[PDB]
Structure 1
C-alpha cells in the first residue's frame, strides 16, 4: 500500500465465526485491523465490535452492515450496556456472496473504515480507544484472516 506497514501481533488465520479474540496491548494510534472474508449469500446483517473486555457491555465501535431497507451500515458505541446515538451511512459497500476486505484504521480522533480499499466511513471516538482489548466478529460472514499492522 501507500504506507509501510509492520505487524503488531500475529495474524488470526481462518478465524471461525462467531470470533472473539484479543487486541494485544490495546488499540493504538496508527493501528490497522484488516478483515478479509466473504459476505454470506443470503446475508441479513453482520457485526464487528471493538470492545473493552469479553461481556460486550462496553463496545467503543460497533460496525453493523444491514442488508435491509436498501442496504445501510450502522456505527455506534455501547457504554455500561447502553447504546448511544446511531450513525447510519445509507449505502451498502458489501455484496451478498462476495469477498471483501474491511480495514479499520485507528487515528487520534477517529476510526477510518475502508472497504475493498476505498474509504467508506469515519467514526469519531466517543470513548478512549486504548481500553479496547477485544475484537468480536459475528453474523452472516466468513473470514479468511484478521491482520494487525502499524505504521
Structure 2
C-alpha cells in the first residue's frame, strides 16, 4: 500500500529536470509512465550540479542493452551493463525505481529488470532528470 507525499509531474517536457521533495528515502518508489519514440537510440534517467548518483541509460545498439553508472566529479565510474533491452521502439512502458537500503530496484512493465547498489548515498539525491528519445505521461512518488 503506497501513499504519495509529493504531487506527480504530469506530461513533463523532455528534457526534464525537477526536484524530489525531501530527497530520496528508503522505501520511496519513483514510477515513470511514458513512451519510447519509434526510432529511439537512447534515453536517460538520472538521479542527481554535475554529479549523477544513478545513471539509467537504455541503448538500442549492439543487440539492445542498458547502462547503469555513477558520475562523480565529471568522471564516469565502471559501467554495470545489463545485456537485454526491456523497452521497445514506439511502445509505452512503465518504469519503476525502488529505493532500498543498499540498492535501487528497477522494474520495467511490472517485472524486475535490474538492481544497482548505491555508490554514493541516496539521501544526497534531490533531483530526477530525464532526457533522450522518449515522451512521458507522468512521474509519481510513493512511499509505503
Bin of the TM-score, shorter chain as denominator length? over 0.9
Of 58, 81, 101, the residue aligned with 2:74 is 81
Three-state SS of the structure 1 residue aligned to 2:6 is: strand
**Counterparts of 2:115 and 2:126 in 1: how far apart (Å)?**
20
**Counterparts of 2:50 and 2:18 in 1: how far apart (Å)?**
16
**Counterparts of 1:80 and 1:134 in 2: how far apart (Å)?**
17
**Counterparts of 2:102 and 2:20 in 1: how far apart (Å)?**
19
Q: Cα offset for 1:81?
A: 1.1
Equivalent residue for 1:47? Answer: 44
**Counterparts of 1:63 and 1:132 in 2: how far apart (Å)?**
14
TM-score, structure 2 normalization:
0.99
Q: Cα offset for 1:57?
A: 1.8
Q: Cα offset for 1:118?
A: 0.3
Equivalent residue for 1:20? Answer: 17
Three-state SS of the structure 2 residue aligned to 1:144 is: strand
Q: Cα offset for 1:9?
A: 0.2
Q: Note the residue ranges of structure 2 that are not aligned, 5 or more in a row.
A: none
Q: 1:90-141 CA distances to partner (integer Å, 9 max, x unpaired)? A: 0000000000000000000000000000000000000010000101000000
TM-score, structure 1 normalization:
0.94
Q: Cα offset for 1:8?
A: 1.9
**Counterparts of 2:72 and 2:135 in 1: how far apart (Å)?**
28
Asked if 2 retains the 8 angstrom alpha-carbon contact of 1:57 and 1:82, the reply is: no
Asked if 2 retains the 8 angstrom alpha-carbon contact of 1:40 and 1:141, the reply is: yes
Runs of 4+ in 1 over 4 A off after TM superposition: none
**Counterparts of 2:14 and 2:50 in 1: how far apart (Å)?**
20
Q: Cα offset for 1:11?
A: 0.5
Asked if 2 retains the 8 angstrom alpha-carbon contact of 1:47 and 1:139, the reply is: yes
Equivalent residue for 2:86? Answer: 93
Three-state SS of the structure 1 residue aligned to 2:7 is: strand
Aligned length: 144
